[model samples]
Target: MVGLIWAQATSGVIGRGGDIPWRLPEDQAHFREITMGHTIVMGRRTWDSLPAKVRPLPGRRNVVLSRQADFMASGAEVVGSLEEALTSPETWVIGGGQVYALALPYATRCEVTEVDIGLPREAGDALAPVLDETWRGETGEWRFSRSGLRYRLYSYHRS
Candidate 1:
């Protein structure tokens, strides 16, 4: 199934150079476990935001869709189209607005690590599409840290 995974935070992911809203350590740990052996599909901008040393989290195959003919990352494979990326047994569509928009049409599930934060007035970047009537969600708090930040795991699947 095609899946979308992301976080919401005070600083938009785009303008802050990837300051995605959630930052709970447990969420990272959970992501690593849940996505192991799965293929990850993302946009070119997401690929660029990654640090050189941690480009691809180990054990997961990364597929990035890019319009540029020659875009490449050391551990991530480049797919010219979204269809090619979704053909895998399971895939996680990571974001950078344009990528999410392109992948959403074909996705069966949207798995978000929704954060307890609001966007700053001036921050501009990609945001998750509204979780509305078209999708039904099952949510649970994954972690509540000492810092008062709460991370909730929400999964939305088409009815």
Candidate 2:
């Protein structure tokens, strides 16, 4: 099965920019725990944000989806198209918007973390991909902390 994962603020809001703004250790822990030993697919921008030491996320495989045929990075393979990544078993689509939209159609599951934060009233330049009717998901127990970050780890599935 394929999975798409992202963390959103409490107001059901995603990132307003190209990258995640909040610095939540718990969120990293959650991602690390679930993604170990799996393959992660992301856009070039997302891959570039990765720290040099954490490039491939240690135990996981990393694949960067880019239109550029010359994209290169250590321990990471480049895919020219989303269709190839989606067809790979146990592939996880990590994001930066563009990659998310391309992989959404083939995703059988979605893992989302809703973080607790206020929603900015202004429209965001960056937005997460819209989920289609083929998916059905639910939010789990919401865990809250003093940082104004409340999160419910959710999972969406399709038959």
Candidate 3:
């Protein structure tokens, strides 16, 4: 099954300047907890944003979707299309925006952290694709508070 794991503000903003604007260690831990040992599909930029020390996330197969023929990501598999990555038995569509948009239709589950702050539009951030109305599911939600920031983790499965 294909799944997506990400965090976004209520405004639907997911990134700013190629990285997540907020600092939420719990969110990172949450992401690692779910995506570990699974195949994760992401765009080239997403791969770029990862820290150099952990460029290709450990314990997971990193598949990067890129149009560049010369794209070389150490410790990662490269694919030209999302279709190819979807062939995996279990894949997590992690992202930058464009990747998420393409993978949303094929995703059977989403683990989204709804953050409390909205980034200013002037920051020129990235937004997650709208979760389509066709996606009918049960959402299991729980709150997380750390360092004065509040967020909710939503586990949504398609019914």
Name model 1 segments beyond 4 Å from true.
Answer: 10-15, 121-123
lDDT of 3 by residue, 1-159 (tens): 999988888888998887788888888888998989999999999999999999889999999999998999999998898997777888998998889989888888988888888566555668877876767655545565675677877777776
How many pairs of residues collide in each model?
2, 1, 0
TM-score against truth, every candidate: 0.85, 0.87, 0.91
Best of the candidates, TM-score: 3
Query: lDDT by residue for model 2 over 1-159, one digit each (tens)?
Result: 788888776554555555566767787888888777888998888888777887777888888888887878788988888876555679888886777778888888888887766766356544566666777888789777646566778888989
lDDT for each residue of candidate 1 in 1-159, tens digit (9 for 90 to 100): 778777665343433556554457766776777677899888877888877788887788888888788876788888788887778978888776777777887788987776666656354667665655888889785578655786678788984
What value of lDDT does candidate 1 attain over all alpha carbons?
0.73
Candidate 2 or 1, higher lDDT: 2
Residue 134 in model 2: lDDT: 77
Model 2: ten consecutive residues of lowest lDDT: 10-19
Off by over 4 Å in 2: 10-13, 16-18, 121-124, 146-148
lDDT of 2 at 86: 56
The predicted structure with the larger TM-score, 2 or 3, is: 3
The total of clashing pairs for model 2 equals 1
- Best-to-worst TM-score order: 3, 2, 1
